[PDB]
Write a protein that binds this ligand. Structure first.
Ligand code: HEM
Ligand code: HEM
Ligand SMILES: *[C@@H]1O[C@H](CO)[C@@H](O[C@@H]2O[C@H](CO)[C@@H](O)[C@H](O)[C@H]2NC(C)=O)[C@H](O)[C@H]1NC(C)=O
Ligand SMILES: *[C@@H]1O[C@H](CO)[C@@H](O[C@@H]2O[C@H](CO)[C@@H](O)[C@H](O)[C@H]2NC(C)=O)[C@H](O)[C@H]1NC(C)=O
Ligand SMILES: *[C@@H]1O[C@H](CO)[C@@H](O[C@@H]2O[C@H](CO)[C@@H](O)[C@H](O)[C@H]2NC(C)=O)[C@H](O)[C@H]1NC(C)=O
Ligand SMILES: *[C@@H]1O[C@H](CO)[C@@H](O[C@@H]2O[C@H](CO)[C@@H](O)[C@H](O)[C@H]2NC(C)=O)[C@H](O)[C@H]1NC(C)=O
Ligand SMILES: *[C@@H]1O[C@H](CO)[C@@H](O[C@@H]2O[C@H](CO)[C@@H](O)[C@H](O)[C@H]2NC(C)=O)[C@H](O)[C@H]1NC(C)=O
Ligand SMILES: *[C@H]1O[C@H](CO)[C@@H](O[C@@H]2O[C@H](CO)[C@@H](O)[C@H](O)[C@H]2NC(C)=O)[C@H](O)[C@H]1NC(C)=O
Ligand code: CA
Ligand code: CA
Lengths: 462, 104, 104, 462
């Protein structure tokens, strides 16, 4: 049991501990870590590789599913209405809520032992990690219910699947089109953007749309953005005093909070009007996840950063230089070469105490610790690395919204003017969303707007 | 793969016509650089003790977090130009793209 | 992987001090372009019938060998600029780089 | 069993015949095919890859071996004399022959029921294919027992492993140096070479030294170089008389031919005096190997170029437009475009009917049928495809003689004086040899020189 033993054997590969750990005061203790399932059971002559359970393509997998069984498991088929399945036992206020996974080991049952809330049932196996992730799966869920209900108004004679599939496309676009129009530019960087992501042109039959085993690590650059609290705001956009700011340690897996604690908006309203923590070389990851990752549920509490560094190892990714090399980027050989590259005489200095040579830094550290891109939120390595994967994901993909055969010229026009705030206004119960680039806006009075000064989708062409 | 598609497949299968398997479900990860294990085939560096990566010993994860990452949780700097949904699209997006099974 | 090799390995286990397995013997092939199978992961393109490669019926190899390969042995053409030892180093070379097994 | 059987069933993947075969006149027959062994038996997510038993390095594997039970078994271990084990009892002219293999299904024995000449044991499992191929293995077997010797003359206290190991180096070195200098540039072009083999700056720990699955098929371009018979000449270089030209068919797996019919010399040379075959679109490959491949040892004789395309489907390689694209070259998507490319309306209209789309033609086909490159003998496909693999074995091999720590400067100096002709001089009974760039001089009044007009080594420098 690698959630309970500390023996370095089989399935396990445990995080042992330094004798001078703030938290863990026993050298015989660890942090519970299993190993990523191989692509070929039975090492012989094939180098081990891990597997991707989900789909590369930017499909709205997290909504719909990844495999046949679960997909059909997530729908109302006691109808031809073409809808997603939703909770028959609890309501938002009137709005839907996700169904409940049926697990023999429910962990969201562990937050509150005095409330029956198992965890939501979604496209993804981890919709409950955080109550806000869930708020999103609950929002996009609403749109393929909203849209199918509306698509039934225009094309009445449409079947049940047609009504659902077609709805699917409308959402896969909502996600794709934001990621690419309102997310990359910003994680990305005005400069890196014109390189990793030039403008669309056609579809490359020959573009590995597959997601690379590194991005699996390089995309975790995000952990550095988390805030140690879960913020709920009313709809005077003020501290929602059931209780407005809760430590992130006592929310992990807590659906109860979502269902009994006030609904999905008070959350959505915090994601929008409270700043995102910013990464600095002095402030990498906050403790609520460095020492309190899942405890209200697990044995001892985990160290994300640390958990990131070991998969590093379990998924035989090479280090911070192969990568650097791998991206026409110079490769620091020395503390000075480093101090210079990083623009840090300290960090570089510190990284070298840990690692002998940069040749050996686990990606995540070198990645989250290089200086931020000009107007970005990522450095060149990640930058390069991260954009080099969203590029293929675009040209690779046969069902890219902008590909010739998918969405007619009008549909396209239409699609082009959707926005995430409008999605948020359409299916939530809030009235003043954020103005453009919610990824960017975040102050109340101002760097926001009302929900009418907002366009609308037009299904007139569908 | 068909002889012709309006909608995507769920397991993401006939997307690409030459390699039906590309960017699909319960399929292997791609490699942009050859793997770097201790064995050479299948054992995480940071596995046997006394094993070195290139010429140096291998750090400990709980060890470097303790050093490079631990920061006074109250010195937090709020990124004034980005909003918390920015981080959420991050998690959600990631979840659309990858997942790597353990063996419960 | 050892320190200061004065000589080589034999199986080639460690030329790459970094990916030791690399270039080695009895490890699998590399693929500079995805693999194209008829199911997408393991069935020869000309395996099941009526299965088209990419809108076209997979042509028989005995037949391609016949229609474009065939020739009147009598009309050979001596490469006046190179001697056999040239076609016989090709092998001595192949024979040093690759070899894929079948099962008895 | 696939030799005696035609079902489409597992180990097998047979070659159905067509309506109008020349050799094979019955539509219920097939030339046999055992498919290639997977890297992961029992996989359902792994994309099928095949194994490589050998070493990609230009180590001299075919002489030394690539597995270490084998290997130990080729050295003679009685003395401390470092030495390749020789034929216990059946020798040349007092010059070594290869050992004998111990095999449960010795094909080379099926050639002359009467004589006992089995397959020769050695580096590669298939050195008995052509008596003209075994002969080289002998020659390399030789320089080894020889260098070892003379080194024993320059350094005594030097043990066995060391006298052999040093000798082994010297050899893989000869084969490297001679393949990068006097073979490749004639089998690739001048240019290709300037685009593929730039000079050797140094070794790159980040170059992928392994063998590409495709090369596997691209290297068989040489199948077009082969000549209908086996020529063996007398010390005067004319028509040698046990019997001059033996058709390539009574030679497959013909060890007796070497032992009994008349030395390694008569072939080793005559190999040296006979113009290689020349490839052209009206003489792709021939019947001696189209219709007689291994037939005195098999049930029906394979069709070479056919196992080739079929071996290609096996590996699961992409067609001719992918690689056309992988290399930076144009991708003709029309018969019209096709002639433009292989300057041959006639074959384009041909290829196009075999295959529907130029995009589905087998690399072999596409490969071999491209016009030869100027001054070379490979298409722009194959030049690229052969030029790049070679570029990497060199740059990704820490034991390439030119690396700066393998052999000393000093060592190297005479080391670049080694020429095959001398190799085939010191080790054989032959006097008069063909001049520098053995590969490029068929002619014989002169197109040859004597054995004094050729330098030697300087183990001195050892
Ligand atoms: C906020 C933006 C985030 C991004 C972009 C992100 C990204 C990633 C990615 C890509 C993975 C590996 C994916 C896989 O193969 O399974 C990962 C792992 C993980 N994340 Fe997140 N993550 C984020 C937030 C969080 C949060 C909020 C938590 C904690 C509440 C967290 C907990 C974890 C855990 C437990 C793992 C597994 C660690 C391991 O096995 O190595 N993540 N995340
Ligand atoms: C002369 C230069 C030659 C070159 C460069 C060459 C190259 C190739 C290559 C690369 C392969 C596959 C290698 C492997 O997977 O192990 C192959 C297969 C084969 N070759 Fe050649 N070869 C040559 C000569 C010959 C000759 C002269 C013969 C017969 C007289 C021959 C008979 C075969 C056979 C029977 C196969 C197996 C067919 C299959 O299943 O793929 N080769 N050779
Ligand atoms: C399937 O769709 C139905 C209809 O939208 C869902 O809700 C019920 O629908 C019927 C008829 O349309 C109404 O009379 C009921 O009042 C509806 N629900 C309730 C609680 O009153 C139904 O819930 C859907 N299936 C799932 C699993 O949610
Ligand atoms: C060693 O070879 C590698 C590959 O041939 C070179 O690495 C590539 O460099 C380019 C820049 O032109 C990068 O965009 C690629 O991502 C790199 N790939 C890899 C695998 O490294 C490398 O530059 C060479 N090293 C030297 C010192 O010349
Ligand atoms: C091992 O080396 C010996 C030494 O050359 C090989 O042949 C013997 O050589 C000695 C010279 O010291 C002769 O006096 C013997 O007569 C040789 N052997 C025979 C059978 O006469 C020996 O052949 C080598 N081992 C193998 C397996 O070839
Ligand atoms: C088969 O192999 C044998 C092996 O010696 C060849 O041997 C010939 O045998 C005849 C009679 O037994 C001798 O008169 C010849 O002198 C041998 N050959 C030579 C060059 O001397 C034999 O020719 C081969 N072919 C057949 C069809 O048996
Ligand atoms: C589709 O993408 C591939 C890869 O991004 C492009 O092909 C590459 O072109 C370079 C330039 O000469 C070659 O060196 C690479 O080897 C190629 N890669 C492959 C996989 O072939 C290709 O040009 C793109 N096609 C189009 C029409 O944009
Ligand atoms: C788990 O859920 C129960 C029920 O929602 C929580 O207790 C509730 O507390 C609120 C606020 O103080 C009261 O309005 C409810 O009436 C309480 N429930 C009951 C059954 O009386 C409980 O606090 C939650 N767990 C924790 C640790 O707070
Ligand atoms: Ca997906
Ligand atoms: Ca070799």
């Amino acid at each position: 049991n690698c959630e309970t033993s500390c023996v370095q054997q089989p399935p396990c590969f445990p995080l042992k501990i330094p004798p001078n750990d703030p938290r863990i005061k026993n050298q015989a203790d660890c942090i519970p870590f299993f190993r990523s399932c191989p692509a070929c059971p039975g090492s012989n002559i094939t180098i081990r590789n891990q597997i991707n359970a989900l789909t590369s393509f930017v499909d709205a997998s997290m909504v719909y599913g990844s495999e046949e069984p679960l997909a059909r498991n997530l729908r109302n088929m006691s109808n031809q209405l073409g809808l997603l399945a939703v909770n028959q036992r609890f309501q938002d206020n009137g709005r839907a809520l996700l169904p409940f996974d049926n697990l023999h080991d429910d962990p969201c049952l562990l937050t509150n032992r005095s409330a029956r809330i198992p965890c939501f049932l979604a496209g993804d196996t981890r919709s409950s990690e955080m109550p806000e992730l869930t708020s999103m799966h609950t929002l996009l869920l609403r749109e393929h219910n909203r849209l199918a209900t509306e698509l039934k108004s225009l094309n009445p004679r449409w079947d049940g699947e047609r009504l659902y599939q077609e709805a699917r496309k409308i959402v896969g676009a909502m996600v794709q089109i934001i990621t690419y129009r309102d997310y990359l530019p910003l994680v990305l960087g005005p400069t890196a953007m014109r390189k990793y992501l030039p403008t669309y042109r056609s579809y490359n039959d020959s573009v590995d749309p597959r997601i690379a085993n590194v991005f699996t690590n390089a995309f975790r650059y995000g952990h550095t953005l988390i805030q140690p609290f879960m913020f709920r705001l009313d709809n005077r956009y003020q501290p929602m005093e059931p209780n407005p700011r809760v430590p992130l340690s006592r929310v992990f897996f807590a659906s109860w909070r979502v269902v009994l604690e006030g609904g999905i908006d008070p959350i959505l309203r915090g994601l929008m009007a409270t700043p995102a923590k910013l990464n600095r070389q002095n402030q990498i990851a906050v403790d609520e996840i460095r020492e309190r990752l899942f405890e209200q549920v697990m044995r001892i509490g985990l160290d994300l950063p640390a958990l990131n560094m070991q998969r590093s190892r379990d998924h035989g990714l090479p280090g911070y230089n192969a990568w650097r090399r791998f991206c026409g980027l110079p490769q620091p050989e020395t503390v000075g070469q480093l101090g210079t590259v990083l623009r840090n005489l300290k960090l570089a200095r510190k990284l070298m105490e840990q690692y002998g040579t940069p040749n050996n830094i686990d990606i995540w550290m070198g990645g989250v610790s290089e200086p931020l891109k000009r107007k970005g939120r990522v450095g060149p390595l990640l930058a390069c690395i991260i954009g080099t994967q969203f590029r293929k994901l675009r040209d690779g993909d046969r069902f890219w919204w902008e590909n010739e055969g998918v969405f007619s010229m009008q549909q396209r026009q239409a699609l082009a003017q959707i926005s995430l705030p409008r999605i948020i206004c359409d299916n939530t119960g809030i009235t003043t969303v954020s103005k453009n680039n919610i990824f960017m806006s975040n102050s109340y009075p101002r760097d926001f707007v009302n929900c009418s000064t907002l366009p609308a989708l037009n299904l007139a062409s569908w | 793969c068909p002889e012709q598609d309006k909608y995507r497949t769920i397991t993401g299968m006939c997307n690409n016509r030459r390699s039906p398997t590309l960017g699909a479900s319960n399929r292997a990860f791609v490699r942009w650089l050859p793997a770097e294990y201790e064995d050479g085939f299948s054992l995480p560096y940071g596995w046997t003790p006394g094993v070195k990566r290139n010429g140096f010993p291998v750090a400990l994860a709980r060890a470097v977090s303790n050093e490079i990452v631990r920061f006074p949780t109250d010195q937090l700097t709020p990124d004034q130009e980005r909003s918390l949904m920015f981080m959420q699209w991050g998690q959600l997006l990631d979840h659309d793209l990858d997942f790597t099974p353990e063996p419960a």
